[PDB]
Design a protein around this nucleic acid. Structure first.
Lengths: 62, 356
RNA sequence: GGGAUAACUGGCUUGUGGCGGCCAAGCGUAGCGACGUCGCUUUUUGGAUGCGGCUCUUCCUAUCAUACCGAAGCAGAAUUCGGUAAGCGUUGGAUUGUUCACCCACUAAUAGGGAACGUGAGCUGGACCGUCGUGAGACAGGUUAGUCCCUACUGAUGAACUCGUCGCAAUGGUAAUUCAGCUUAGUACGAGAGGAACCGCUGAUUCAGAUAAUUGGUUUUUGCGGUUGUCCGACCGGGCAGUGCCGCGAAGCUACCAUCUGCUGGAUAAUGGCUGAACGCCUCUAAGUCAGAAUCCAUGCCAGAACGCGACGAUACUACCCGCACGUUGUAGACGUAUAAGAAUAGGCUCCGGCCUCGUAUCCUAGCAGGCGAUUCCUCCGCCGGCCUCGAAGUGGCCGUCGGUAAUUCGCGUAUUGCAAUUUAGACACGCGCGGGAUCAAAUCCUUUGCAGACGACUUAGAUGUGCGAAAGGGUCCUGUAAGCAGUAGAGUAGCCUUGUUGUUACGAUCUGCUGAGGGUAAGCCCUCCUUCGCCUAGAUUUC
RNA sequence: GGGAAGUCGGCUCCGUAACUUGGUACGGACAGGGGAAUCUGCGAGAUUCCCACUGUCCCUAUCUACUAUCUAGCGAAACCACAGCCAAGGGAACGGGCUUGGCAAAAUCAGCGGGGAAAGAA
RNA sequence: CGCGGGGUUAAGGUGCCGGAGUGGACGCUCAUCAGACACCACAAAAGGCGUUAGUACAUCUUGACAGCAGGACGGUGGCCAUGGAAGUCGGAAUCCGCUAAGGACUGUGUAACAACUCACCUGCCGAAUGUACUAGCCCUGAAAAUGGAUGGCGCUCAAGCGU
């Protein structure tokens, strides 16, 4: 019996993944993400545009 | 036993953690990975099987299915992580405004005697023109992070449980640029997300839970007998498990009023068994109906997540035509789907005359 | 009877016999002598054996099977020999005192060994004297030796780092296995008989991890009913027989007696190649490189370092931040603790002229431990702000104010620390102070819960609520038709008066009706619109 | 009580008539019971299944004996040079302290299947 | 070999652990668990298309080795044997001519031929080769079973080997 980690079995799984499950899950994800989007859309320093500082060690203290 | 589930220890946390989200690429659409629910029980069904090559092909088979009460989860935060030579590091998290009493209960341990003062300064940070700082945190997530997760909590006060403390977890966002994921989460703030929005029917998922404990049990039941390699006595049960490849057979909407009805059985009935789920109650919310047994006791917190790998089987590409769902009593040998059926079968009674 | 020796093997052991002749590079100047070949064993017709057995852990490969290869008249199928492989599995019968061989059944196959003088752990099936003899032994003649704790492992708690929530993942563990059926296909192949395989599909064995809808089993639900003996005077309702006995029996627990799930990348070995030298042919190899095993390392999976790390929430005192006064406060060890390209080394850099052994280089480097004033200078520092920048464990640029400043020269002061005595001078940390700003929290005990449990521990609830608790009602399950009354239904047991062709009056098993009634129902079932009653902002400890 | 294993296991007499006290012909009777069920209308009721032995093994049943966590109180003994983590090496089949490496973090609870026990040699 | 201070050595060492050299000169070796003083054993007249040094013999501008382009012929399908056997299923002899050279043939091949190829020869090319041994270093020259040992790290123009 071919092991579950056999190279030929892995290649067959890769082909099956790429030619059937790929498209099926892509369509499923498109619909689900559509529903997610439906529910979702249902000065620099003084404004936050410039990402500034909020509020053991890696170096030796001098 | 297996030397792969050792150090046979009690689960460090009751919730159970995902430990691995599926790998992310920007080409897919933006979506959430995981969800949460509470085990209500399990029941019996009949499926018209279409497994080309099987002896039960084009035949009716009887199957056991587990039912998960899934009230909509609420998004209350957004966390951003960065890649480092030591792994992923949580760079920063920005919460939502108007957190719920249930998530604040999650934060507190003695909620009754406490002054309920959590996140008040953070709400003031929203309101008092520190929104510059909050936008700065969002932009830091946009420009520095590689993976984004969203903070979401369940609705106990809809779940028929004595508990009042909710459950937080991070659900990873996949399929897009970091900016797209940040905008998605920020827009998802203060909004309920549904299980039919995260998953749908016909899809195999992975269930993370803590399997039931049995206390100090000897080797006879701990391993299955007649150095770490030698069977020893100790804790058996209460173990974190991730069970893979469980088929989502149905998602019931809770407000449908005909959740258990199929296109073959024209009975306006819901999923809750006649008399209620034993030790759980009634399912009045969105529920997930999945094949087979699942780790965890009734009313236990459960994590439902997407499969890590694209599937390699025809059982994952199949449609599930349901014929009927059992709603008889689980409290004993029940033979009636509805109280109306029981009354029609047994006629009228002495107490019926006395009351009427 | 005396003397010596008193254990013994310990880079031991394995696949190829010994003897004689011939040949024989050599050594040698006759003798030693391998590989072969000849002669003997040995040829012209097809039982042996005289400590064993079973279970479990781990390891070896000297591999029986499964995976991949090389060869064989290997047509196909079935195979044989050999190579890489220990990832994964690895019997029974007959017989015998036991074992083996042979022989016989399954099976994919039903390999061999080690645990180191005690064959890992567990279980099981005599010599000294005395006497009498000696062609030789005998003695119920005596004597004699018979040496509950620490730790490993397996689980469970845990102090200090304020409590808490959400995470990361160093390291350690690691898992799947074999068979069958369908299609390919009665195809390739074959005279015939026969007869595959790759892709694709569906099941089953073993192993592993879960789960209880269903289906069995289990019953202290002592839940309901029947029944034996005795007792409470009888009915009813019950006690006793360490759970009397029987039947059903939820809940819980269980069961390959039930059901569910078991996942994918890279690099390799044998081997097969590409380009191409050594060596003007050639060559898979030397430089370079392609594929390839159930192998190796990882992902998926389990744990999480209790002295590994991160994000966020709220932080009463304390001191939470700031200014500056310091500390007779700590430091595996300031004293200019100064200096960022990348990349090659059979090459590189650049200002595009040229330069590169060489960091014995560049910057900085003067002043009472660094004073005061002036001539003169726009040079180098510094602190605050503004705009922006830096996320691998988070900083720097420009501008702006203000502050200091030998690039040149000069004046006034240095003395006395007495001829040297660490030139107490930096940094980070922590403490104690002042005067300015800000804030008014949690955990534990306790009661409670059963998603948990040896006990800790864990999931919960406890401040007014979609609250908690006790009852009740309804629902759902279990049992199987309560007590009592009545009907001439009533098998039967007896009185009235006289014949009864229909005589009456009483009792009465059993039957039927009221009665799927009666009882139990969460103790680890379900629901409650004001169903009823009650409870409640506590009291003790601890925390920067 | 049940299951399993092995077996070679399952499935003539009375009266009557002639003959030499005994035989001969004739007539009649013989060559089951128990338990569990199914089918037709209790019925000649019809049909189905199980009955064994053993110096064998296992399980169920009864009896006997030892079997027991925490709390309050009370309360010993055995034994004790000092100790207790490993691997290699340490000529004298010798390691526990030595060499050099793996490492190594307070205080505990429970389980326990390993170690802390063994020769003397013809 | 009394208790102390100073100096210098031995055997052994100088990549810290570890005091003293990543000291100097000339070479050699890459090992799929090298070696670091074991040289006793396995172990042989052993296997190596690893590498370096050397001894002997032989061929070379009269053109050596390797290659490429060509020849490789005739008596003769020599004798015997075979159903068939022509150099090439088999036994034995194995000569001559033409020669530059060519075996009564070294392999592939045919039923037997035919055909190809080797031996040998010539042309092109152009300068050193090729056979056996010897001596160093290196690979093999046999190994089981808890995880471990040049003392450990590690070391490759060495931190290995010789002077």
């Amino acid at each position: 019996a071919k092991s579950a980690r056999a190279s030929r079995i892995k290649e067959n799984h890769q082909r099956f993944k790429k030619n059937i499950a790929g498209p099926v899950e892509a369509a499923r994800l498109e619909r689900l993400s559509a529903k997610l989007m439906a529910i979702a859309q249902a000065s620099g320093v003084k404004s936050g545009k410039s990402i500034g500082r909020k509020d053991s060690s890696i170096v030796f203290p001098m | 036993g297996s030397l792969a589930f050792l150090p046979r220890k009690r689960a460090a946390r009751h919730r159970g953690r995902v430990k691995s989200f599926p790998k992310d690429d920007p080409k897919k659409p933006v979506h959430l990975t995981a969800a949460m629910g509470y085990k209500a029980g399990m029941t019996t069904i009949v499926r018209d099987l279409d497994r080309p090559g099987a002896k039960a092909h084009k035949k009716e088979v009887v199957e056991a299915v587990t039912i998960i009460d899934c009230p909509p989860m609420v998004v209350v935060g957004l966390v951003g992580y960065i890649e480092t030579p030591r792994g992923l590091r949580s760079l920063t998290t920005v919460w939502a405004e108007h957190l719920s009493d249930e998530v604040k209960r999650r934060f507190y341990k003695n909620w009754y005697k406490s002054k309920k003062k959590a996140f008040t300064k953070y709400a003031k940070k929203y309101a008092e023109n520190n929104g510059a700082s909050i936008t700065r945190e969002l932009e830091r997530i946009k420009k520095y992070c590689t993976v984004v997760r969203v903070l979401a909590h369940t609705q106990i006060r809809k779940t028929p449980l004595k508990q009042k403390k909710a459950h937080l977890m991070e659900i990873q966002i996949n399929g897009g640029s970091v900016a797209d994921k940040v905008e998605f989460g920020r827009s998802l703030f203060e909004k309920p997300v549904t299980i039919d929005t995260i998953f749908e029917k016909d899809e195999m998922i992975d269930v993370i839970a803590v399997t039931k404990g049995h206390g100090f049990v000897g080797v006879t039941a701990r391993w299955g007998t007649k150095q770490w390699t030698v069977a020893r006595a100790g804790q058996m049960g209460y173990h974190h498990r991730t069970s893979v490849n469980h088929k989502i057979y149905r998602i019931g909407k809770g407000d449908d009023e005909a959740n258990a009805s199929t296109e073959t059985d024209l009975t306006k009935k819901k999923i809750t068994p006649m008399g209620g789920f034993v030790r759980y109650g009634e399912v009045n919310n969105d529920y997930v109906m999945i094949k087979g047994s699942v780790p965890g006791v009734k009313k236990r917190i459960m994590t439902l997540r997407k499969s890590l790998f694209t599937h390699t089987s025809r059982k994952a590409l199949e449609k599930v035509e349901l014929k009927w769902i059992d709603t008889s009593s689980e409290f004993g040998h029940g033979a009636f789907q509805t109280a109306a059926e029981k009354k029609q079968f047994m006629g009228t009674l002495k107490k019926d005359l006395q009351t009427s």
